Paper text:
To clearly understand the mechanism of the R156A mutation affecting peptide binding, the crystals of [name]-1*04:01 and [name]-1*04:01 (R156A) were both solved with the same peptide [name] derived from [name] (MY9 in short). The two structures, [name]-1*04:01MY9 and [name]-1*04:01 (R156A)MY9, were determined in the C121 and P1211 space groups with resolutions of 2.0 Å and 1.8 Å, respectively. The MY9 peptides in the two structures had a clear electronic density map and adopted the traditional overall “M” conformation. However, a comparison of the main chain structure of the peptide (root-mean-square deviation (RMSD) = 1.172 Å) showed a significant difference in the central region of the P5, P6, and P7 residues, which are recognized by TCR. In [name]-1*04:01MY9, 156Arg formed a hydrogen bond with P4-His, but in [name]-1*04:01 (R156A)MY9, 155Arg interacted with P4-His. This led to conformational changes in P4-His in the two structures. In [name]-1*04:01MY9, 156Arg also bound to P6-Thr and pulled the sidechain of P6-Thr toward the α2 helix, causing 152Glu to form two hydrogen bonds with P6-Thr. The Tm value of [name]-1*04:01 (Tm = 45.6°C) was slightly higher than that of [name]-1*04:01(R156A) (Tm = 43.4°C). The positively charged 156Arg made the D pocket of SLA-1*04:01 prefer negatively charged P3 residues. The nonapeptide binding motif of SLA-1*04:01 determined by RPLD-MS perfectly matched the existing conclusion derived from structural and peptide binding data: PΩ has obvious selectivity with aromatic amino acids; the B pocket allows many hydrophobic and small residue insertions; and the D pocket prefers the negatively charged or small amino acids.
Author numbering:
A (entry chain A): 1 to 275
B (entry chain C): 1 to 9
C (entry chain B): 2 to 100
């Protein structure tokens, strides 16, 4: 349904073992399209899909420099956090940020978001109003006072309502080919003779886009997620996604079980049996 | 397009 | 702070059939901090691999995809070997074309 533009920043302090590492990745829905990494041999903002390269040189110039500034500010913020939590200058630490915007049907902001984590735990988050902040602890409260004084929420709101959705609108036409078409899953059921008191039924979903999907198993109509193994959705490596759901059934009751697949690329809920 | 960083932590 | 061991999934890009080119993938996910070492191995010996860009999930845990071109056959054995601060020794997960 809704389309999104999102950026993910990771900053890793390597304390007196170098300089701070910074990597940024950009996504339009579940498709990555740019990347920057300052531990890379030659840090530059690079394309990662074909369509994004039909952009001009000005784009790569602006984006490269902007993320290069952001990386230095994050190297600063890592040591600021170091101080807030009163931590030593020797152990490595992590600062993550994710932000982005979802487009409504009208072509304007449905909702925007911006959240940070320090060492894998919630730090500070912009609330859905794009005007107030939720701080997880009293160090994030220091950061929140700073951002209240600088009226930072208004800066983020201006970005999320303007440049974010405008960039997303343009990206959604440069990559019209693959961004605005859904790929339904290619599904099949696999049988494994495990023992003589159980065979394993595996329901596969391959080559689907976007990432969200529902895979469940039923017997004569009732759900069996209570005894079902469900792997985390994983990338195929070509921009699509894979998943499977397996369960143990008695030998001879294979037809008694059905796999149910739900995905926006399908016209109606899919049902599957081992054949 | 990425956002400009406007505040420190 | 936090430390999380990676979930490791070893699989092919497409369903494996002997003789046809394909991609071997090791997907590491749900780990933290970001430093991690991944090797793809053919019959216990290391291969030469590419990898996706570091990103993370909604719960802040990292994920990476390492992959390499390969042609499966009946007897060659493939695996992924992962090293992380949470792992006292490198963890090996073997490829099963059915999982």
């Amino acid at each position: 349904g809704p389309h999104s533009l999102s950026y993910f920043y990771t900053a890793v302090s390597r304390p007196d073992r170098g300089d701070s590492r910074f990597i940024a990745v950009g996504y339009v829905d579940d498709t990555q399209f740019v990347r920057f990494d300052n531990y890379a041999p030659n840090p530059r903002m690079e394309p990662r899909v074909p369509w994004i390269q039909q952009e001009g040189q000005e784009y790569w110039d602006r984006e490269t420099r902007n993320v290069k500034e952001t990386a230095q500010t994050y190297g600063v913020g890592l040591n600021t956090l170091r101080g807030y939590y009163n931590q030593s200058e020797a152990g490595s630490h992590t600062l993550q940020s994710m932000y982005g915007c979802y487009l409504g049907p009208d072509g304007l902001l449905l909702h925007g978001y911006r959240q940070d984590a320090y060492d894998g735990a919630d730090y500070i988050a912009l609330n859905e109003d794009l005007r107030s902040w939720t701080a997880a602890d009293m160090a994030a409260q220091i950061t929140k006072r700073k951002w209240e004084a600088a009226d930072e929420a208004e800066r983020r709101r201006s970005y999320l309502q303007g440049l974010c959705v405008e960039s997303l609108r343009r990206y959604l036409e440069m990559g019209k080919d693959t961004l605005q078409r859904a790929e339904p899953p290619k599904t099949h059921v696999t049988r494994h003779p495990s023992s003589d008191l159980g065979v394993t039924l595996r329901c596969w979903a391959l080559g689907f886009y976007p990432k969200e999907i529902s895979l469940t198993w039923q017997r004569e109509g009732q759900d069996q997620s209570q005894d079902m193994e469900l792997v985390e959705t994983r990338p195929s490596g070509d921009g699509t996604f894979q998943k499977w759901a397996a369960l143990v059934v008695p030998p001879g009751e294979e037809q008694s079980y059905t796999c149910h697949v739900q995905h926006e690329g399908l016209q109606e809920p899919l049902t599957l049996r081992w054949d | 397009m990425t956002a400009h960083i406007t505040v420190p932590y | 702070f936090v430390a999380r061991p990676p979930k490791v999934q070893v699989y092919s890009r497409h369903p494996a059939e002997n003789g046809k080119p394909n991609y071997l993938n090791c997907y590491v996910s749900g780990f933290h901090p970001p430093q991690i070492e991944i090797d793809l191995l053919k019959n216990g010996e290391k291969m030469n691999a590419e990898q996706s860009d570091l990103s993370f999930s909604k719960d802040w845990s990292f994920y990476l995809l390492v992959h390499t071109e390969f042609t499966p056959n009946a007897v060659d054995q493939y695996s992924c070997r992962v090293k992380h601060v949470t792992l006292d020794k490198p963890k090996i997960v073997k490829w099963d074309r059915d999982h």
